[PDB]
Write a protein that binds this ligand. Structure first.
Ligand SMILES: Nc1ccn([C@H]2C[C@H](O)[C@@H](COP(=O)(O)OP(=O)(O)OP(=O)(O)O)O2)c(=O)n1
Ligand SMILES: [Mg+2]
Ligand SMILES: [Mg+2]
Lengths: 392, 548
DNA sequence: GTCCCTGTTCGGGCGCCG
DNA sequence: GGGCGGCGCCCGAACAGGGACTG
């Protein structure tokens, strides 16, 4: 028995061109889709359906199984346990298969259309649409929620110190058990479901001022720039006595001895930068914005905010130092780690301002993607100023 | 015949009604061609006579079929196309011969009267009304030519029709462009011919004939604009217009033929030719060739006078793309597997950004080639690039964006891609320090650019018809002019800093180009930033200077 | 806000195929 | 001679986003 679903008023469905796939992805998509057709989960359709969302496939590590991934970002556009972030361990199970057990409202099926391409355009695209709740669609958890609650009730009763949160296709299972017993309980839940993160140890990356015992005109100019910018986040910051040392027209490499007043100003400012940002309240009706800066040598900084200079979080991701590193691969893993953090803390994905060229990103990001959701993003060409301000 | 395949349901856009458009005058030649076509189509039920209960009409014409003495019937369905529902096109790209593999046996088949063999939705037929004038009125029961739905409906129907044959014959390869079939197989010529008979009998069961006249059995095969020989392929000859006075239409024709040519001809360049089209107002306007365009066109002509072919794809070998730099942000490339046997060639010339350099452009060319290789062969190629691993490493360190090139290897064919100057990370001891600024008045458009230096020098230049950003750039240009081989510059301008930090070697801005000349002549430059209007350093002094 | 600069998209010509 | 869809190229027009500015 079906559940009617409509589009937001004044909105038509998605018309998004499919991008080129590699041979391995097309072969996996064709085999997966053939089985899905044999089981009634999808139906071939024609060009009289004017809708389309792109499709690709990811091969999970430690597994020769491919998983299909429909980018439902547009379609989703057009349609919380605060104790999970504190748990010792949190496992992330993939429960997407459950959705294929529930039919989809007939009048909605047309909007889930997708096209499989072919190598060297041997054939026109093969088009399908969904007959069941598709993985990666905003409506799938919503419509399945009641069956999910019935499925999880007795396991939650028998384990009240365990937190089970659902996001799009994933279960987050949080516990304070030791790692072996945690994995035992997770397999207990996997067995029950036939009807590895560690969030307590995530780090804020504060803004830091340089420490040294000889300052030049350049050093002080750079520090005044950084503090002037930072005072938009922390109003306590003050630059009068530091910029007083810069009067005149001096050489960049001239050594400037700090006065008593300016030394106090600097120590007070570096204290102020420890206090937490005042007046930052999460709004669920606005979206999270995540900025990322490439700091170099495998280091990346990021800030999650909703209004400018009111950061909900500020962090850094580190990776392999630069022997044979891949900037785009690392940027992608950084995006997934940030999205995971944001889903766990606020239950919502951020919109990323990515410091990469549109084309470089779209050429390569699907070779390193391992999640079942995809966040929104836009592309950016920042001044190196914000880079310096968050740098270490 | 007419295919017994199910029709594709088609609707008009809500609130719209069929077209009512008078028929044109036609020549007697076109009338005779149309009546010969329509008598036969009506006999076969592909069209039906209609009466006064059908209040619609759309004009018709014919054209000689391009490679025959036979006619093609076309309808000017522009109004109906405006009023017809949207489709999702299923033809995602164009097959390329460099993506075909070696086959024992090859056949090329054309379907006869392709659109006219595929039924059209019953309910929609009435809006296809047309009139053959006198010396008769009809409606289409099949797909017409000129309707926007016919390509997609045909391509999808043909896919459906071929699916059972493909399921039964997985290891027979059928490249399916509209009604063109290239069929390849690893069978001896005998079993192959038997399977081609099976395929023609399958198609005929579904209403599609394969007349012998277009059944190609022996090489070279004429396919998709190419000549396919057993172990090599070529392009059917390109003929460039050879006029004396050139118009925008002639130029577009030239540039289009040259772009088509560059897929197998190495070295094609169209920059100066394309630049000719810059300020045009209409297709008919006459443009005199620049000396640069003249010479470029002669070079392209010489290139095209040469005999050249591609080869087919061996999956058990690597794809190698090799890139060569031409001037003005122009690049050619060659994709091959064995040393002097190109799979195909190409050119990249897109101008991306007001300001850029050759490492950015080469990264863009790599990206383009990678996406094109994924489309044609399904994998990424290994690269041979004219850029030192050291140069790339330097750029990738200094640059603030994520950037990356796949597996690659240096190649020593000049001109090599280099960074032409490097900003210091730390200020320069013993270099004079310039504090620069510019101000511009938004009402009068007058400005000043200027500097003050720590050794006492101060200079202010006045500018007309300028802007804030331009005065900032002008001040930096003034400091570069008036300094020695090593210089520290302090600016309050995020604009100028972001530009110069990214190390451009080319710009559409004359002023930025002049700056670049200067920065290449210098030995050490250090560019520092301070926030404006906070009373910092000599920034206050030069700010008080350039305001008046 | 306005003016400026820059990047993306989309539509128009032409090429090529059918 | 004209009509259609796909892909390609190049160009310019429209629009979006961010920095600098005036009293
Ligand atoms: N200039 C063209 C060429 C082709 N087509 C479409 C309609 C054609 O029917 C189909 C295939 O092209 P053909 O030249 O093969 O046309 P036919 O199949 O009708 O002719 P024939 O029987 O000679 O093959 O593609 C078109 O609309 N305009
Ligand atoms: Mg034909
Ligand atoms: Mg200024």
């Amino acid at each position: 028995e079906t559940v009617p679903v409509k589009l937001k008023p004044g909105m038509d469905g998605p018309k998004v061109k499919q991008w080129p796939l590699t041979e391995e992805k097309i072969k996996a998509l064709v085999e997966i889709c053939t089985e899905m057709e044999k089981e009634g989960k999808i139906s071939k359709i024609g060009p009289e359906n004017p809708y389309n969302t792109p499709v690709f496939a990811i091969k999970k590590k430690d597994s020769t199984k491919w998983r299909k991934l429909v980018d439902f970002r547009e379609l989703n556009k057009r349609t919380h346990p605060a104790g999970l972030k504190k748990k010792k361990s949190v496992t992330v199970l993939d429960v997407g298969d459950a959705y294929f057990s529930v039919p989809l409202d007939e009048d909605f099926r047309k909007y889930t259309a997708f096209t499989i391409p072919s190598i060297n355009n041997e054939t026109p695209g093969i088009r399908y649409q969904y007959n069941v709740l598709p993985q990666g669609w905003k409506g799938s958890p919503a419509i399945f929620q009641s069956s999910m609650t019935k499925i999880l009730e007795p396991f939650r009763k028998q384990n009240p110190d365990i937190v089970i949160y659902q996001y799009m296709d994933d279960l987050y299972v949080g516990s304070d058990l030791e790692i072996g017993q945690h994995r035992t309980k997770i397999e207990e839940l996997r067995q029950h479901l036939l009807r590895e993160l560690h969030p307590d140890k995530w780090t804020v990356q504060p803004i830091v001022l340089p420490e040294k015992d000889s300052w030049t005109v350049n050093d002080i100019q750079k520090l005044v720039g950084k503090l002037n910018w930072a005072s938009q986040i922390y109003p306590g910051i003050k630059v009068r006595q530091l910029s007083k040392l810069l009067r005149g027209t001096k050489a960049l490499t001239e050594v400037i001895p700090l006065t008593e007043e300016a030394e106090l100003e600097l120590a007070e400012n570096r204290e102020i930068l420890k206090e937490p940002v005042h007046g930052v309240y999460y709004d669920p009706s606005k979206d999270l914005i995540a900025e990322i800066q490439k700091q170099g040598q495998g280091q990346w900084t990021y800030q999650i905010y909703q209004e400018p200079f009111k950061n909900l979080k500020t962090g850094k991701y580190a990776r392999m130092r630069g022997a044979h590193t891949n900037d785009v691969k690392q940027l992608t893993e950084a995006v997934q780690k940030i999205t995971t953090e944001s889903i766990v803390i606020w239950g919502k994905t951020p919109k990323f301002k990515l410091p990469i060229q549109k084309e470089t990103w779209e050429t390569w990001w699907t070779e390193y993607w391992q999640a079942t959701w995809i966040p929104e993003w836009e592309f950016v060409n920042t001044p190196p100023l914000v880079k310096l301000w968050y740098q270490l | 015949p007419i295919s017994p395949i199910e029709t594709v349901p088609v609707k008009l856009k809500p609130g719209m009604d069929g077209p009512k458009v008078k028929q044109w005058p036609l020549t007697e030649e076109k009338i005779k061609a149309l009546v010969e076509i329509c008598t036969e189509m009506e006999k076969e039920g592909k069209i039906s006579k209609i009466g006064p209960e059908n209040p619609y009409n759309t004009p018709v014409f014919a054209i000689k079929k391009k490679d025959s003495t036979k006619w093609r019937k076309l309808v000017d369905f522009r109004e109906l196309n405006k009023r017809t529902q949207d489709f999702w096109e299923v033809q995602l790209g164009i097959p390329h011969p460099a993506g075909l593999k070696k086959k024992k046996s090859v056949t090329v088949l054309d379907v006869g009267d392709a659109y006219f063999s595929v039924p059209l939705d019953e309910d929609f037929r009435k809006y296809t009304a047309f009139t053959i004038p006198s010396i008769i009125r009809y409606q289409y029961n099949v797909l017409p030519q000129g309707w926007k739905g016919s390509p997609a409906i045909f391509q999808s129907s043909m896919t459906k029709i071929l699916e059972p044959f493909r399921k039964q014959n997985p290891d027979i390869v059928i490249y399916q462009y509209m009604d063109d079939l290239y069929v390849g197989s690893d069978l001896e010529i005998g079993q192959h011919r038997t399977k081609i008979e099976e395929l023609r009998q399958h198609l005929l069961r579904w209403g599609l004939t394969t007349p012998d006249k277009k059944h190609q059995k022996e090489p070279p095969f004429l396919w998709m604009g190419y000549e396919l020989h057993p172990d090599k392929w070529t392009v059917q000859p390109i003929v460039l217009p050879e006029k004396d006075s050139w118009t925008v239409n002639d130029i577009c024709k030239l540039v289009g033929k040259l772009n088509w040519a560059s897929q197998i001809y190495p070295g094609i360049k169209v920059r100066q030719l394309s630049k000719l089209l810059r300020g045009t107002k209409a297709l008919t306007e006459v443009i005199p060739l620049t000396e640069e365009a003249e010479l470029e066109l002669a070079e392209n002509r010489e290139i095209l006078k040469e005999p050249v072919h591609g080869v087919y794809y061996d999956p058990s070998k690597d794809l190698i793309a090799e890139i060569q730099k031409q001037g003005q942000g122009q690049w050619t490339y060659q994709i091959y597997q064995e040393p002097f046997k190109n799979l195909k060639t190409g050119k990249y010339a897109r101008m991306r950004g007001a300001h850029t350099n050759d490492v950015k452009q080469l990264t863009e060319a790599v990206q383009k080639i990678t996406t094109e290789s994924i489309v044609i062969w399904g994998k990424t190629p290994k690269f041979k690039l004219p850029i030192q691993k050291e140069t790339w490493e330097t750029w990738w360190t200094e640059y603030w964006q994520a950037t990356w090139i796949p597996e690659w290897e240096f190649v020593n064919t000049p001109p090599l891609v280099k960074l032409w100057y490097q900003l210091e990370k730390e200020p320069i001891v013993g270099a004079e320090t310039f504090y620069v600024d510019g101000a511009a008045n938004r009402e009068t458009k007058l400005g000043k650019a200027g500097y003050v230096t720590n050794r006492g020098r101060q200079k202010v230049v006045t500018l007309t018809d300028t802007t804030n950003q331009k005065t900032e750039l002008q001040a930096i240009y003034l400091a570069l002019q008036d300094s020695g081989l090593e210089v520290n510059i302090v600016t309050d301008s995020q604009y100028a800093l972001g530009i110069i930090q990214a190390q451009p070697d080319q710009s559409e801005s004359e002023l930025v180009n002049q700056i670049i000349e200067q920065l290449i002549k210098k030995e050490k430059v250090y560019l520092a930033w301070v926030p404006a209007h906070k009373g910092i350093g000599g920034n206050e002094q030069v700010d008080k200077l350039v305001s008046a």
